[PDB]
Amino acid sequence: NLPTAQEVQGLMARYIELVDVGDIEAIVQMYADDATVENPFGQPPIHGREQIAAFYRQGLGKVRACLTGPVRASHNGCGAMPFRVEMVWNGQPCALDVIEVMRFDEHGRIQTMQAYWSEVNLSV
Amino acid sequence: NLPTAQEVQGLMARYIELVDVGDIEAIVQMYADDATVENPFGQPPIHGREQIAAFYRQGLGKVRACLTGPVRASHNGCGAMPFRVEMVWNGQPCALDVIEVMRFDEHGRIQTMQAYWSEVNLSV
Numbered sequence: 001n002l003p004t005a006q007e008v009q010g011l012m013a014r015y016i017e018l019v020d021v022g023d024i025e026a027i028v029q030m031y032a033d034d035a036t037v038e039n040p041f042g043q044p045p046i047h048g049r050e051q052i053a054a055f056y057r058q059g060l061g062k063v064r065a066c067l068t069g070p071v072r073a074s075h076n077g078c079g080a081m082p083f084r085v086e087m088v089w090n091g092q093p094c095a096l097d098v099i100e101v102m103r104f105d106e107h108g109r110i111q112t113m114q115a116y117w118s119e120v121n122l123s124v
Numbered sequence: 125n126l127p128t129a130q131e132v133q134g135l136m137a138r139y140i141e142l143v144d145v146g147d148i149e150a151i152v153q154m155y156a157d158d159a160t161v162e163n164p165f166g167q168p169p170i171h172g173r174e175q176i177a178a179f180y181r182q183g184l185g186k187v188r189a190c191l192t193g194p195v196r197a198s199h200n201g202c203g204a205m206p207f208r209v210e211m212v213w214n215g216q217p218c219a220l221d222v223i224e225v226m227r228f229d230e231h232g233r234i235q236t237m238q239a240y241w242s243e244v245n246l247s248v
């Protein structure tokens with residue numbers, strides 16, 4: 001905990017900006033060294049900056065990301081947000097609806113991220 | 125951890141429907157008998173149907189609720205959804221934006237629920 005409810009809304013909106021531009025290195029600097037990511041939730045986790053970097057380089061190396069509603073934030077450093085990811089799959093233009101939950105540490109870095117989505121949230 | 129992702133989407137949308145109509149009986153029964161709920165997340169857990177039913181008894185005891193986006197569903201019995209609650213803050217109508225994350229058991233009942241929101245999500 002520590003970042004405020006207001007700080008958490010901003011940190012999370014910023015994360016979506018970076019994904020939308022595709023600035024891979026800025027994204028990764030947002031995560032704690034030790035951060036763990038579960039994306040999609042239900043999969044073995046990604047542990048550490050290095051492994052986390054790999055996901056973004058591979059997934060983000062023509063993708064667009066837009067928040068589709070307000071960031072919901074608590075007072076113990078956690079937040080949840082709904083967004084859409086636009087991409088192209090084998091020529092097929094797709095959109096994926098996702099909801100992510102994040103826990104920030106005292107330095108304002110992402111310690112934990114979990115993403116909720118599956119094929120049922122895939123759209124053409 | 126057994127309803128399918130499509131089943132999760134349906135269970136969760138039903139729950140918003142019952143909340144909307146105020147069917148407190150039907151809601152409580154959606155929960156496991158020893159389910160735990162954190163609403164708001166950050167607040168200590170209310171446990172077991174009796175305690176959970178008290179939340180809905182008094183909370184919903186001119187409240188409207190509606191999904192404001194698709195229910196995101198995983199493959200391990202978890203789902204997350206964005207919705208808004210409309211109530212009255214003494215005299216004036218306001219709205220609250222919430223995101224809830226739910227885990228279901230083999231019986232299709234809510235074993236856990238976490239509600240993400242704070243004052244930053246309240247608009248008059």
Ligand SMILES: C[C@]12CCc3c(ccc4cc(O)ccc34)[C@@H]1CCC2=O
Pocket residue numbers: 019039058059060063085087096098100115
């Ligand atoms: C990897 C991916 C692109 C980006 C992306 C996906 C899923 C969840 C995400 C969550 C994020 O916080 C940021 C980016 C993604 C997609 C799944 C299919 C695909 O092409």
Ligand SMILES: C[C@]12CCc3c(ccc4cc(O)ccc34)[C@@H]1CCC2=O
Pocket residue numbers: 143163182183184187209211212220222224239
């Ligand atoms: C109790 C309440 C009405 C309903 C409600 C609130 C907060 C979270 C909720 C989560 C639910 O899954 C269902 C209903 C609510 C509101 C807080 C202020 C208020 O009037």
